[PDB]
Scaffold this active site. Structure first.
Site, PDB file in Angstrom:
ATOM      1  N   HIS A 209       2.787  24.107   6.681  1.00 11.96           N
ATOM      2  CA  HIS A 209       4.240  24.033   6.289  1.00 11.96           C
ATOM      3  C   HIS A 209       4.312  23.787   4.881  1.00 11.96           C
ATOM      4  O   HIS A 209       5.363  24.313   4.260  1.00 11.96           O
ATOM      5  CB  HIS A 209       5.065  23.320   7.180  1.00 11.96           C
TER       6      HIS A 209
ATOM      7  N   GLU B  42      -5.954  11.152  -8.151  1.00 13.08           N
ATOM      8  CA  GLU B  42      -4.747  10.821  -8.720  1.00 13.08           C
ATOM      9  C   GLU B  42      -4.108   9.403  -8.104  1.00 13.08           C
ATOM     10  O   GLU B  42      -4.392   9.366  -6.953  1.00 13.08           O
ATOM     11  CB  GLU B  42      -3.734  11.947  -8.438  1.00 13.08           C
TER      12      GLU B  42
ATOM     13  N   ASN C 265      -1.248   7.504 -10.027  1.00 13.91           N
ATOM     14  CA  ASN C 265       0.276   7.356 -10.298  1.00 13.91           C
ATOM     15  C   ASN C 265       0.844   8.979 -10.654  1.00 13.91           C
ATOM     16  O   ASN C 265       0.231   9.441 -11.778  1.00 13.91           O
ATOM     17  CB  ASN C 265       0.551   6.370 -11.614  1.00 13.91           C
TER      18      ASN C 265
ATOM     19  N   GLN D 165       2.037   8.926 -14.659  1.00 17.42           N
ATOM     20  CA  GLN D 165       1.296   8.335 -15.874  1.00 17.42           C
ATOM     21  C   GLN D 165      -0.328   8.751 -15.547  1.00 17.42           C
ATOM     22  O   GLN D 165      -0.814   9.016 -14.680  1.00 17.42           O
ATOM     23  CB  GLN D 165       1.814   6.921 -15.965  1.00 17.42           C
TER      24      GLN D 165
ATOM     25  N   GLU E 223      -7.833  11.480 -13.289  1.00 13.89           N
ATOM     26  CA  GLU E 223      -7.511  12.906 -12.723  1.00 13.89           C
ATOM     27  C   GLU E 223      -8.328  14.143 -12.890  1.00 13.89           C
ATOM     28  O   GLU E 223      -8.889  14.307 -14.014  1.00 13.89           O
ATOM     29  CB  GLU E 223      -6.093  13.145 -12.856  1.00 13.89           C
TER      30      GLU E 223
ATOM     31  N   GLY F 228       7.354  14.706   1.622  1.00 20.72           N
ATOM     32  CA  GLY F 228       6.442  14.586   0.382  1.00 20.72           C
ATOM     33  C   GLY F 228       5.142  14.011   0.778  1.00 20.72           C
ATOM     34  O   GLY F 228       4.080  14.260   0.162  1.00 20.72           O
TER      35      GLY F 228
ATOM     36  N   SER G  59       3.771  15.031   3.794  1.00 23.61           N
ATOM     37  CA  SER G  59       3.128  16.015   4.613  1.00 23.61           C
ATOM     38  C   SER G  59       1.927  16.812   4.085  1.00 23.61           C
ATOM     39  O   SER G  59       1.760  16.772   2.891  1.00 23.61           O
ATOM     40  CB  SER G  59       4.227  17.182   4.382  1.00 23.61           C
ATOM     41  N   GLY G  60       1.043  17.042   5.018  1.00 22.67           N
ATOM     42  CA  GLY G  60      -0.011  17.582   4.624  1.00 22.67           C
ATOM     43  C   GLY G  60      -1.143  16.462   4.165  1.00 22.67           C
ATOM     44  O   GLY G  60      -2.552  16.663   4.308  1.00 22.67           O
TER      45      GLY G  60
END
Ligand SMILES: [Ca+2]
Length: 240
Positions: A45, A59, A61, A64, A69, A186, A188-189
């Site tokens: 979805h 990742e 934050n 910032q 990352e 947020g 999800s996944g």
């Protein structure tokens, strides 16, 4: 994640942020689990919309520079062929993303370990949900990655009438339901990490919560059961 605590930077290195291009910037929309250096497992979805997606690994934050990352485009999206957007309760909420480049592994970026096929956890097994999703029902996304301790609720209990009833299938894992701690929009996944024989493995892909709210008693967060899809996952990666 409602009722979470901030995760340590190196606790859950397979967690990724799935983001979509929004104007001149990128917006977090979902979590995912890095499962090969160039494949991410997420929820079907999360990738129904015709958006441009990228994955951020390492990742911590969203708001910032963490100094850790790596940002990589999504080159191919393979949704489970039985997924139907109008019917999350049917299951099949799982998708694989082939990344445009292979990411570099380190303390912040590692492959998620998946359960063996068919594995079912005993009731009340210890797991953590992680993610940057809302920290309250109708709230706002987290800045820093959050975790919440969400013990499983087995299929018998979870599909009983005062829990999720017929909505929950044996292809899903339920966890939490305490009215305090939960996934939320947020998340999800992303992963549900469960400790088994001393090792965390990713047993769930976050799928849904109640229309009534995120942290609702006897509406535990519901996840796609990773161990129901091991053959599908292997087949996709081998054919792509
Ligand atoms: Ca950052």
């Amino acid at each position: 994640v409602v009722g979470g605590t901030e995760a340590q930077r190196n606790s859950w290195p397979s967690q990724i942020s799935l983001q979509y291009r929004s104007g001149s910037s990128w917006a977090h929309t979902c979590g995912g689990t890095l499962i090969r250096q160039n494949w991410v497992m997420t929820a079907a979805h999360c990738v129904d919309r015709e958006l441009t997606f990228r994955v951020v690994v390492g990742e911590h934050n969203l708001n910032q520079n963490n100094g850790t990352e790596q940002y990589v485009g999504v080159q191919k999206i393979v949704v489970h062929p039985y997924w139907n957007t109008d019917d999350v309760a049917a299951g099949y909420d799982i998708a694989l993303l082939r990344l445009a480049q292979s990411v570099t592994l380190n303390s912040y970026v590692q492959l998620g370990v998946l359960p063996r096929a068919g594995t079912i956890l005993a009731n009340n097994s210890p797991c953590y949900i992680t993610g940057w999703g809302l920290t309250r029902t109708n709230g706002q996304l987290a800045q820093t990655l959050q975790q919440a301790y969400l013990p499983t609720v087995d299929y018998a209990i979870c599909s009983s009438s005062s829990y999720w009833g017929s909505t929950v299938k044996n292809s899903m894992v339920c966890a939490g339901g305490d009215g305090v701690r939960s996934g939320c929009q947020g998340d999800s996944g992303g992963p549900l990490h469960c400790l088994v024989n001393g090792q965390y493995a990713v047993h769930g892909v976050t799928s849904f919560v109640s229309r009534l709210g995120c942290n609702v008693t006897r509406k535990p967060t519901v996840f796609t059961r990773v161990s129901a899809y091991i053959s599908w996952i292997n087949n996709v990666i081998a054919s792509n």
